Amino acid sequence: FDEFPIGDEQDAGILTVAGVYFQPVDMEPAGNSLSKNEADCHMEADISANEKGATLGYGAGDFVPYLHVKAYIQKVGSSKVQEVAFMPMNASDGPHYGANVKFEEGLGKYNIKFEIKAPGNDYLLHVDKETGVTGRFWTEPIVVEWKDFEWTGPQW
């Protein structure tokens, strides 16, 4: 399928973070985000380990699971912000974090931020010397932002 970038991919710590969107999708189980018919697009965070992820045991290019990913979508100049929890999921091209999304204020200029919280109690690390890792997770959320994203309707 055709995917459209929100902007250039960005590195943050051990992460390589890409943002893409395309047509709304059907998901199973359903009911987490908007239905395909109610949504404007499907939007996803492609989050993989870079070369630095080996400090935490990740191989380069590996999907990084158990993160807590939320998108903040704000029409430039608006006092309202949409906050959409992304869910981990597979498409035919592998794993992502994503959700079906509606741009509530219509076609126009938006700021899009992905907030990426570490797993917390959801993913552990061996820390002993014989089998453990010396890297550690981040305690404040990583925030990757693209400013002035232009939503001009379907591209498909």
mmCIF file with all atom_site columns, C-alpha atoms in Angstrom:
data_model
loop_
_atom_site.group_PDB
_atom_site.id
_atom_site.type_symbol
_atom_site.label_atom_id
_atom_site.label_alt_id
_atom_site.label_comp_id
_atom_site.label_asym_id
_atom_site.label_entity_id
_atom_site.label_seq_id
_atom_site.pdbx_PDB_ins_code
_atom_site.Cartn_x
_atom_site.Cartn_y
_atom_site.Cartn_z
_atom_site.occupancy
_atom_site.B_iso_or_equiv
_atom_site.pdbx_formal_charge
_atom_site.auth_seq_id
_atom_site.auth_comp_id
_atom_site.auth_asym_id
_atom_site.auth_atom_id
_atom_site.pdbx_PDB_model_num
ATOM 1   C CA . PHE A 1 1   ? 0.000   0.000   0.000  1.00 0.00 ? 1   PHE A CA 1
ATOM 2   C CA . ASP A 1 2   ? 1.049   3.628   -0.459 1.00 0.00 ? 2   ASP A CA 1
ATOM 3   C CA . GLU A 1 3   ? 2.213   5.489   2.662  1.00 0.00 ? 3   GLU A CA 1
ATOM 4   C CA . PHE A 1 4   ? 2.692   9.241   3.036  1.00 0.00 ? 4   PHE A CA 1
ATOM 5   C CA . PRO A 1 5   ? 5.262   10.800  5.389  1.00 0.00 ? 5   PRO A CA 1
ATOM 6   C CA . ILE A 1 6   ? 4.230   13.342  7.982  1.00 0.00 ? 6   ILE A CA 1
ATOM 7   C CA . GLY A 1 7   ? 7.797   14.637  7.773  1.00 0.00 ? 7   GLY A CA 1
ATOM 8   C CA . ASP A 1 8   ? 11.361  13.396  7.863  1.00 0.00 ? 8   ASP A CA 1
ATOM 9   C CA . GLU A 1 9   ? 12.173  10.589  10.279 1.00 0.00 ? 9   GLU A CA 1
ATOM 10  C CA . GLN A 1 10  ? 13.916  11.681  13.484 1.00 0.00 ? 10  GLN A CA 1
ATOM 11  C CA . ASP A 1 11  ? 16.353  9.988   15.854 1.00 0.00 ? 11  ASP A CA 1
ATOM 12  C CA . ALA A 1 12  ? 15.848  10.330  19.596 1.00 0.00 ? 12  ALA A CA 1
ATOM 13  C CA . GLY A 1 13  ? 18.166  8.441   21.909 1.00 0.00 ? 13  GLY A CA 1
ATOM 14  C CA . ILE A 1 14  ? 18.163  4.765   20.939 1.00 0.00 ? 14  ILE A CA 1
ATOM 15  C CA . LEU A 1 15  ? 15.100  5.275   18.713 1.00 0.00 ? 15  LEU A CA 1
ATOM 16  C CA . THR A 1 16  ? 14.523  5.978   15.041 1.00 0.00 ? 16  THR A CA 1
ATOM 17  C CA . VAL A 1 17  ? 11.023  7.437   14.728 1.00 0.00 ? 17  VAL A CA 1
ATOM 18  C CA . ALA A 1 18  ? 9.090   7.830   11.480 1.00 0.00 ? 18  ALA A CA 1
ATOM 19  C CA . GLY A 1 19  ? 5.578   9.181   11.105 1.00 0.00 ? 19  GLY A CA 1
ATOM 20  C CA . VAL A 1 20  ? 3.327   8.203   8.185  1.00 0.00 ? 20  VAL A CA 1
ATOM 21  C CA . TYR A 1 21  ? -0.343  8.333   7.247  1.00 0.00 ? 21  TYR A CA 1
ATOM 22  C CA . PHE A 1 22  ? -2.643  6.721   4.668  1.00 0.00 ? 22  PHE A CA 1
ATOM 23  C CA . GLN A 1 23  ? -6.288  5.674   4.238  1.00 0.00 ? 23  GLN A CA 1
ATOM 24  C CA . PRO A 1 24  ? -8.232  4.602   7.344  1.00 0.00 ? 24  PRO A CA 1
ATOM 25  C CA . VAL A 1 25  ? -8.014  0.857   7.990  1.00 0.00 ? 25  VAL A CA 1
ATOM 26  C CA . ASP A 1 26  ? -10.067 -1.915  9.586  1.00 0.00 ? 26  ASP A CA 1
ATOM 27  C CA . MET A 1 27  ? -8.500  -3.384  12.724 1.00 0.00 ? 27  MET A CA 1
ATOM 28  C CA . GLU A 1 28  ? -9.112  -6.649  14.611 1.00 0.00 ? 28  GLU A CA 1
ATOM 29  C CA . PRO A 1 29  ? -10.050 -6.588  17.450 1.00 0.00 ? 29  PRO A CA 1
ATOM 30  C CA . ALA A 1 30  ? -11.937 -3.385  16.660 1.00 0.00 ? 30  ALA A CA 1
ATOM 31  C CA . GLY A 1 31  ? -13.243 -0.619  18.890 1.00 0.00 ? 31  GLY A CA 1
ATOM 32  C CA . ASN A 1 32  ? -10.016 1.014   20.112 1.00 0.00 ? 32  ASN A CA 1
ATOM 33  C CA . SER A 1 33  ? -9.920  4.089   17.837 1.00 0.00 ? 33  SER A CA 1
ATOM 34  C CA . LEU A 1 34  ? -12.334 5.447   15.220 1.00 0.00 ? 34  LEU A CA 1
ATOM 35  C CA . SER A 1 35  ? -14.026 3.246   12.658 1.00 0.00 ? 35  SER A CA 1
ATOM 36  C CA . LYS A 1 36  ? -12.684 3.365   9.119  1.00 0.00 ? 36  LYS A CA 1
ATOM 37  C CA . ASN A 1 37  ? -15.828 5.189   7.984  1.00 0.00 ? 37  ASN A CA 1
ATOM 38  C CA . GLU A 1 38  ? -15.563 7.777   10.778 1.00 0.00 ? 38  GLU A CA 1
ATOM 39  C CA . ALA A 1 39  ? -11.843 8.496   10.263 1.00 0.00 ? 39  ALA A CA 1
ATOM 40  C CA . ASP A 1 40  ? -9.863  10.745  7.926  1.00 0.00 ? 40  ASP A CA 1
ATOM 41  C CA . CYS A 1 41  ? -6.704  8.651   7.871  1.00 0.00 ? 41  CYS A CA 1
ATOM 42  C CA . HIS A 1 42  ? -4.757  5.937   9.584  1.00 0.00 ? 42  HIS A CA 1
ATOM 43  C CA . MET A 1 43  ? -1.681  7.431   11.275 1.00 0.00 ? 43  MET A CA 1
ATOM 44  C CA . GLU A 1 44  ? 1.222   5.460   12.684 1.00 0.00 ? 44  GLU A CA 1
ATOM 45  C CA . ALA A 1 45  ? 4.526   5.804   14.513 1.00 0.00 ? 45  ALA A CA 1
ATOM 46  C CA . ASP A 1 46  ? 7.224   3.530   13.098 1.00 0.00 ? 46  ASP A CA 1
ATOM 47  C CA . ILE A 1 47  ? 9.597   3.071   16.050 1.00 0.00 ? 47  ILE A CA 1
ATOM 48  C CA . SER A 1 48  ? 12.745  0.983   15.699 1.00 0.00 ? 48  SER A CA 1
ATOM 49  C CA . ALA A 1 49  ? 16.054  0.701   17.483 1.00 0.00 ? 49  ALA A CA 1
ATOM 50  C CA . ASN A 1 50  ? 19.069  2.438   16.023 1.00 0.00 ? 50  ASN A CA 1
ATOM 51  C CA . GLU A 1 51  ? 22.720  1.428   16.485 1.00 0.00 ? 51  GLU A CA 1
ATOM 52  C CA . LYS A 1 52  ? 22.603  2.773   20.065 1.00 0.00 ? 52  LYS A CA 1
ATOM 53  C CA . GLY A 1 53  ? 19.821  0.365   21.062 1.00 0.00 ? 53  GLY A CA 1
ATOM 54  C CA . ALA A 1 54  ? 22.408  -2.360  21.636 1.00 0.00 ? 54  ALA A CA 1
ATOM 55  C CA . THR A 1 55  ? 23.125  -0.683  24.986 1.00 0.00 ? 55  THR A CA 1
ATOM 56  C CA . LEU A 1 56  ? 19.668  -1.947  26.012 1.00 0.00 ? 56  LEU A CA 1
ATOM 57  C CA . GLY A 1 57  ? 19.877  -5.292  24.203 1.00 0.00 ? 57  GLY A CA 1
ATOM 58  C CA . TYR A 1 58  ? 18.047  -4.238  21.017 1.00 0.00 ? 58  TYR A CA 1
ATOM 59  C CA . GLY A 1 59  ? 19.361  -5.164  17.606 1.00 0.00 ? 59  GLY A CA 1
ATOM 60  C CA . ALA A 1 60  ? 19.565  -2.356  15.071 1.00 0.00 ? 60  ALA A CA 1
ATOM 61  C CA . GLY A 1 61  ? 16.332  -2.008  13.113 1.00 0.00 ? 61  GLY A CA 1
ATOM 62  C CA . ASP A 1 62  ? 14.344  -4.097  15.599 1.00 0.00 ? 62  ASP A CA 1
ATOM 63  C CA . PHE A 1 63  ? 10.830  -2.977  16.428 1.00 0.00 ? 63  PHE A CA 1
ATOM 64  C CA . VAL A 1 64  ? 10.743  -1.601  19.970 1.00 0.00 ? 64  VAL A CA 1
ATOM 65  C CA . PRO A 1 65  ? 7.666   -3.036  21.725 1.00 0.00 ? 65  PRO A CA 1
ATOM 66  C CA . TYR A 1 66  ? 5.831   -2.143  24.949 1.00 0.00 ? 66  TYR A CA 1
ATOM 67  C CA . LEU A 1 67  ? 6.235   1.625   24.520 1.00 0.00 ? 67  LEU A CA 1
ATOM 68  C CA . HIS A 1 68  ? 3.354   3.942   25.451 1.00 0.00 ? 68  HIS A CA 1
ATOM 69  C CA . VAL A 1 69  ? 2.773   6.088   22.362 1.00 0.00 ? 69  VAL A CA 1
ATOM 70  C CA . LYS A 1 70  ? 0.339   9.014   22.147 1.00 0.00 ? 70  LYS A CA 1
ATOM 71  C CA . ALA A 1 71  ? -0.195  11.492  19.310 1.00 0.00 ? 71  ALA A CA 1
ATOM 72  C CA . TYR A 1 72  ? -1.007  15.146  19.944 1.00 0.00 ? 72  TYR A CA 1
ATOM 73  C CA . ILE A 1 73  ? -2.719  16.834  16.992 1.00 0.00 ? 73  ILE A CA 1
ATOM 74  C CA . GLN A 1 74  ? -3.264  20.604  17.170 1.00 0.00 ? 74  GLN A CA 1
ATOM 75  C CA . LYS A 1 75  ? -4.607  22.891  14.479 1.00 0.00 ? 75  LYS A CA 1
ATOM 76  C CA . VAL A 1 76  ? -2.108  25.763  14.355 1.00 0.00 ? 76  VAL A CA 1
ATOM 77  C CA . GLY A 1 77  ? -3.597  28.670  16.271 1.00 0.00 ? 77  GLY A CA 1
ATOM 78  C CA . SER A 1 78  ? -6.223  26.540  18.021 1.00 0.00 ? 78  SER A CA 1
ATOM 79  C CA . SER A 1 79  ? -6.685  26.249  21.768 1.00 0.00 ? 79  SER A CA 1
ATOM 80  C CA . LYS A 1 80  ? -7.835  22.610  21.354 1.00 0.00 ? 80  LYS A CA 1
ATOM 81  C CA . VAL A 1 81  ? -5.506  19.593  21.159 1.00 0.00 ? 81  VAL A CA 1
ATOM 82  C CA . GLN A 1 82  ? -6.525  16.063  20.170 1.00 0.00 ? 82  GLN A CA 1
ATOM 83  C CA . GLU A 1 83  ? -4.743  13.358  22.203 1.00 0.00 ? 83  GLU A CA 1
ATOM 84  C CA . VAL A 1 84  ? -4.986  9.854   20.612 1.00 0.00 ? 84  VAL A CA 1
ATOM 85  C CA . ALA A 1 85  ? -3.440  6.809   22.240 1.00 0.00 ? 85  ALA A CA 1
ATOM 86  C CA . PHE A 1 86  ? -1.721  4.682   19.602 1.00 0.00 ? 86  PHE A CA 1
ATOM 87  C CA . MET A 1 87  ? -1.915  0.907   19.782 1.00 0.00 ? 87  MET A CA 1
ATOM 88  C CA . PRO A 1 88  ? 0.746   -1.617  18.738 1.00 0.00 ? 88  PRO A CA 1
ATOM 89  C CA . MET A 1 89  ? -0.382  -3.601  15.712 1.00 0.00 ? 89  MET A CA 1
ATOM 90  C CA . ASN A 1 90  ? 0.740   -5.462  12.603 1.00 0.00 ? 90  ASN A CA 1
ATOM 91  C CA . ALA A 1 91  ? -0.039  -4.541  9.032  1.00 0.00 ? 91  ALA A CA 1
ATOM 92  C CA . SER A 1 92  ? 1.119   -6.523  6.013  1.00 0.00 ? 92  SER A CA 1
ATOM 93  C CA . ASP A 1 93  ? 4.416   -4.578  6.256  1.00 0.00 ? 93  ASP A CA 1
ATOM 94  C CA . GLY A 1 94  ? 5.082   -5.458  9.913  1.00 0.00 ? 94  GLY A CA 1
ATOM 95  C CA . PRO A 1 95  ? 4.698   -3.753  13.299 1.00 0.00 ? 95  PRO A CA 1
ATOM 96  C CA . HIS A 1 96  ? 3.779   -0.148  14.081 1.00 0.00 ? 96  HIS A CA 1
ATOM 97  C CA . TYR A 1 97  ? 2.036   1.949   16.699 1.00 0.00 ? 97  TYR A CA 1
ATOM 98  C CA . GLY A 1 98  ? -1.064  3.545   15.228 1.00 0.00 ? 98  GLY A CA 1
ATOM 99  C CA . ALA A 1 99  ? -4.713  4.601   15.217 1.00 0.00 ? 99  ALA A CA 1
ATOM 100 C CA . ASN A 1 100 ? -7.460  5.751   12.889 1.00 0.00 ? 100 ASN A CA 1
ATOM 101 C CA . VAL A 1 101 ? -7.603  9.564   13.211 1.00 0.00 ? 101 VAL A CA 1
ATOM 102 C CA . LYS A 1 102 ? -9.971  12.403  12.274 1.00 0.00 ? 102 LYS A CA 1
ATOM 103 C CA . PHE A 1 103 ? -8.687  15.976  11.892 1.00 0.00 ? 103 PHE A CA 1
ATOM 104 C CA . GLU A 1 104 ? -11.400 17.596  13.971 1.00 0.00 ? 104 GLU A CA 1
ATOM 105 C CA . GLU A 1 105 ? -10.883 21.116  12.652 1.00 0.00 ? 105 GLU A CA 1
ATOM 106 C CA . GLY A 1 106 ? -10.840 20.129  8.984  1.00 0.00 ? 106 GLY A CA 1
ATOM 107 C CA . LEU A 1 107 ? -8.355  20.679  6.194  1.00 0.00 ? 107 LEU A CA 1
ATOM 108 C CA . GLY A 1 108 ? -5.545  22.982  7.283  1.00 0.00 ? 108 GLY A CA 1
ATOM 109 C CA . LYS A 1 109 ? -2.175  23.420  8.977  1.00 0.00 ? 109 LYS A CA 1
ATOM 110 C CA . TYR A 1 110 ? -1.494  21.155  11.992 1.00 0.00 ? 110 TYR A CA 1
ATOM 111 C CA . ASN A 1 111 ? 1.286   20.429  14.477 1.00 0.00 ? 111 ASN A CA 1
ATOM 112 C CA . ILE A 1 112 ? 1.739   16.702  15.188 1.00 0.00 ? 112 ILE A CA 1
ATOM 113 C CA . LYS A 1 113 ? 3.697   15.380  18.180 1.00 0.00 ? 113 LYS A CA 1
ATOM 114 C CA . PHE A 1 114 ? 4.374   11.752  19.079 1.00 0.00 ? 114 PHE A CA 1
ATOM 115 C CA . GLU A 1 115 ? 4.925   11.309  22.832 1.00 0.00 ? 115 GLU A CA 1
ATOM 116 C CA . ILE A 1 116 ? 6.856   8.112   23.492 1.00 0.00 ? 116 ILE A CA 1
ATOM 117 C CA . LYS A 1 117 ? 6.977   6.838   27.089 1.00 0.00 ? 117 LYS A CA 1
ATOM 118 C CA . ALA A 1 118 ? 9.309   4.032   28.090 1.00 0.00 ? 118 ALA A CA 1
ATOM 119 C CA . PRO A 1 119 ? 7.714   0.688   29.049 1.00 0.00 ? 119 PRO A CA 1
ATOM 120 C CA . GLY A 1 120 ? 7.904   1.294   32.798 1.00 0.00 ? 120 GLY A CA 1
ATOM 121 C CA . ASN A 1 121 ? 6.873   -1.883  34.640 1.00 0.00 ? 121 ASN A CA 1
ATOM 122 C CA . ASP A 1 122 ? 5.783   -3.486  31.303 1.00 0.00 ? 122 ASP A CA 1
ATOM 123 C CA . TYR A 1 123 ? 9.258   -4.502  30.044 1.00 0.00 ? 123 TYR A CA 1
ATOM 124 C CA . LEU A 1 124 ? 12.188  -5.475  32.254 1.00 0.00 ? 124 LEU A CA 1
ATOM 125 C CA . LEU A 1 125 ? 15.966  -5.390  31.883 1.00 0.00 ? 125 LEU A CA 1
ATOM 126 C CA . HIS A 1 126 ? 18.529  -7.837  33.174 1.00 0.00 ? 126 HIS A CA 1
ATOM 127 C CA . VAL A 1 127 ? 20.941  -5.638  35.168 1.00 0.00 ? 127 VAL A CA 1
ATOM 128 C CA . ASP A 1 128 ? 23.383  -8.165  36.625 1.00 0.00 ? 128 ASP A CA 1
ATOM 129 C CA . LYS A 1 129 ? 26.907  -8.137  35.267 1.00 0.00 ? 129 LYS A CA 1
ATOM 130 C CA . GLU A 1 130 ? 26.925  -11.612 33.713 1.00 0.00 ? 130 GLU A CA 1
ATOM 131 C CA . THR A 1 131 ? 23.692  -11.388 31.699 1.00 0.00 ? 131 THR A CA 1
ATOM 132 C CA . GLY A 1 132 ? 22.565  -7.753  31.986 1.00 0.00 ? 132 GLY A CA 1
ATOM 133 C CA . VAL A 1 133 ? 22.687  -4.482  30.060 1.00 0.00 ? 133 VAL A CA 1
ATOM 134 C CA . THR A 1 134 ? 24.258  -1.171  31.075 1.00 0.00 ? 134 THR A CA 1
ATOM 135 C CA . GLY A 1 135 ? 21.837  1.091   29.224 1.00 0.00 ? 135 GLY A CA 1
ATOM 136 C CA . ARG A 1 136 ? 18.657  2.324   30.882 1.00 0.00 ? 136 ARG A CA 1
ATOM 137 C CA . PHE A 1 137 ? 15.260  3.576   29.693 1.00 0.00 ? 137 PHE A CA 1
ATOM 138 C CA . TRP A 1 138 ? 14.385  7.286   29.599 1.00 0.00 ? 138 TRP A CA 1
ATOM 139 C CA . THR A 1 139 ? 12.369  8.685   32.480 1.00 0.00 ? 139 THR A CA 1
ATOM 140 C CA . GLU A 1 140 ? 10.813  11.667  30.717 1.00 0.00 ? 140 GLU A CA 1
ATOM 141 C CA . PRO A 1 141 ? 8.792   10.926  27.534 1.00 0.00 ? 141 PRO A CA 1
ATOM 142 C CA . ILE A 1 142 ? 10.549  11.376  24.208 1.00 0.00 ? 142 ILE A CA 1
ATOM 143 C CA . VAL A 1 143 ? 8.589   13.906  22.121 1.00 0.00 ? 143 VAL A CA 1
ATOM 144 C CA . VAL A 1 144 ? 9.099   13.914  18.341 1.00 0.00 ? 144 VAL A CA 1
ATOM 145 C CA . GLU A 1 145 ? 7.305   16.853  16.663 1.00 0.00 ? 145 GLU A CA 1
ATOM 146 C CA . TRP A 1 146 ? 6.574   17.848  13.058 1.00 0.00 ? 146 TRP A CA 1
ATOM 147 C CA . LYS A 1 147 ? 5.453   21.472  12.745 1.00 0.00 ? 147 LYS A CA 1
ATOM 148 C CA . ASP A 1 148 ? 3.076   22.833  10.054 1.00 0.00 ? 148 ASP A CA 1
ATOM 149 C CA . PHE A 1 149 ? 1.899   19.488  8.668  1.00 0.00 ? 149 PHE A CA 1
ATOM 150 C CA . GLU A 1 150 ? -0.624  20.280  5.908  1.00 0.00 ? 150 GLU A CA 1
ATOM 151 C CA . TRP A 1 151 ? -3.740  18.087  5.958  1.00 0.00 ? 151 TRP A CA 1
ATOM 152 C CA . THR A 1 152 ? -5.318  18.690  2.533  1.00 0.00 ? 152 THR A CA 1
ATOM 153 C CA . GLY A 1 153 ? -7.620  15.687  2.372  1.00 0.00 ? 153 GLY A CA 1
ATOM 154 C CA . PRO A 1 154 ? -7.180  12.160  1.045  1.00 0.00 ? 154 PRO A CA 1
ATOM 155 C CA . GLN A 1 155 ? -4.122  11.326  -1.051 1.00 0.00 ? 155 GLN A CA 1
ATOM 156 C CA . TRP A 1 156 ? -5.631  8.015   -2.200 1.00 0.00 ? 156 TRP A CA 1
#
